[PDB]
């Protein structure tokens, strides 16, 4: 992996000590030719949750253009999901967005909608 | 090459707090993991807990929960474990040593002894373990605190056979150990025996004659 | 939460030899085992991790093997600078634990102690106290037993004892026992002994004295 990434099973992974909206997240991960972090099983939520914790962190996860995508064209339907209880409940807003679109893994690992100007850490990730 | 430099040893009354330093060097300090291992005399090794810089997240055994907190100075390359509410149980030798996500401690630290105790500084009296084919006498080096004392023979002439023993703790908080050489009984009546005790943290030396 | 269990405690062997020690976790951790060496005075070395894989430099005469629950390391023909302790440890979920160690010991011929037995000093008398020191020196294997006897009843908790480590050129051990009384107490009695047992001895060995 490149310098100051985290190498991990065939991926390296870049965790941010500070905060952006999730769009803006995603587009320093695009610039690092990654992506938010896509996670696609249980072992991986294993490793985010274990150097993420306790902060809420962005992951490549968003229903911003009406349905759950993820960032690299993962499907979302049929894969590997971690949903808190309750979640994805698309909570109404106004000042960090409409609405609760994009994906954040919480404290205990869960994911959670939340809104998209939220200033959170984030991860990339990318192929090794 | 990496490097892990830990700070000194520290001496400490119970129920104080003591902050132990890691400078890491050699690798991108940011992209793994410090572990904290504990090691008391003689035992085995205990694993603390784990801090990953990059993020400051930190993961303990629950048995450190109270007692030990990690944090990192991220601008020195440093990680830090305090231990506070010390106990005696909390001597012993501290080592900070990397790794990776579900990976072994791939380098260590020179280790941080703590001994943490009441006692006070305190010089050693020095005994003779009189002899009476091959003798053996000795000096019995008692009460003392901190380690260590130095225990040599006729000035450092004497080597051969001699045996200096490691301290124990006595229940009063004090060290005592003995230091014992054979040499030919026929060398009792002609060859003066001396060992010379040195203890620096309470300036003691004694150079104790051990006659027949 | 997972206990690591190593054996044997204590393993004597020779340059050239081969050895295996083992470990057990008491819950699969499938290949997430290190090995570690540790030289007496030194920090632990990474020897082994995922069970089987090597350490960057470490010598290949170091092999580990084993997933689940049981896993080994075996070491083909030994150095000299293989001598020391090895420890185990999950780097599975953390929190990581720990076997609690092995010792690799230089073995070499069954020697039996030769014992003295050493009166408290007249110096330390004059102080209230009344130390007997009992010396077993240069025997070999390590186990050994020394019980203290004061006009024939034998003591409990008013003694201590050191062992050396192996001795750099003979590889033998040496003991001290110290039994500790107040000077009352002490001339409150006459013959002290010290009762030597180890196993290169044919019966129990007794240095005594009296006053
Ligand atoms: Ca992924
Ligand atoms: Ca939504
Ligand atoms: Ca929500
Ligand atoms: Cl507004």
Known sequence: ??????????????????????????????????????????????????????????????????????????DYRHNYKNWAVTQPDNWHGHELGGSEDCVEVQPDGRWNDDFCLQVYRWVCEKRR | QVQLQQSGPELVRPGTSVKISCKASGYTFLTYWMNWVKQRPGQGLEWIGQIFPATGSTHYNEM????????????SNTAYMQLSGLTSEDTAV??????????????????????????????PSVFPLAPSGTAALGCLVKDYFPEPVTVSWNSGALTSGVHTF???????????????????????????????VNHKPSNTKVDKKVEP | DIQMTQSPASLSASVGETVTITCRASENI???????????????????????????????RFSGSGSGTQFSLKINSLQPEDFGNYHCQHHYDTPY????????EIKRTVAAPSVFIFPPSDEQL??????????????????????????????????????????????????????????????????????????????????????
């Open chain 3, 30 to 60: 499938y290949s997430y085992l290190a090995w570690y060496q540790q030289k007496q005075g030194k920090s632990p070395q990474l020897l082994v991790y995922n069970a089987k894989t090597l350490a960057e430099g470490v010598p290949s």
């Open chain 2, 64 to 75: 450190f929960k109270d007692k030990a907190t990690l944090n990192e100075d991220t601008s």
């Open chain 2, 94 to 123: 501290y080592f900070c040593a990397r790794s990776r996500y579900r990976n072994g401690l791939d380098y260590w630290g020179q280790g941080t002894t703590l001994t943490v105790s009441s006692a006070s500084t305190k010089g």
């Open chain 2, 166 to 196: 490691p301290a124990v703790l006595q229940s009063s908080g004090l060290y005592s150990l003995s230091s014992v050489v054979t040499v030919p009984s026929s060398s009792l009546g002609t060859q003066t025996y001396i060992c010379n």
């Open chain 1, 1 to 74: 992996c490149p310098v100051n990434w985290v190498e991990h099973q065939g991926s390296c992974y870049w965790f941010s000590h500070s905060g952006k909206a999730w769009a803006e997240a995603e587009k320093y991960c695009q610039l690092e030719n990654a992506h938010l972090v896509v996670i696609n099983s249980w072992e991986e939520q294993k490793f985010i949750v274990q150097h993420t914790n306790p902060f809420n962190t962005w992951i490549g996860l968003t229903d911003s253009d009406g349905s759950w995508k993820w960032v690299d064209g993962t």
């Open chain 3, 97 to 104: 634990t720990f076997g609690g160690g092995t010792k690799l």
């Open chain 3, 126 to 211: 004059k102080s209230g106290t009344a130390s007997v020191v009992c010396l077993l020196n240069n025997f070999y294997p390590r186990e050994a037993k020394v019980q203290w006897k004061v006009d024939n009843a034998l003591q409990s908790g008013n003694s201590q004892e050191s062992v050396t480590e192996q001795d750099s050129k003979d590889s033998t051990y040496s003991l001290s026992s110290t039994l500790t009384l107040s000077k009352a107490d002490y001339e409150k009695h006459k013959v002290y002994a010290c009762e030597v047992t180890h196993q290169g001895l044919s019966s129990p060995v007794t240095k005594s004295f009296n006053r």
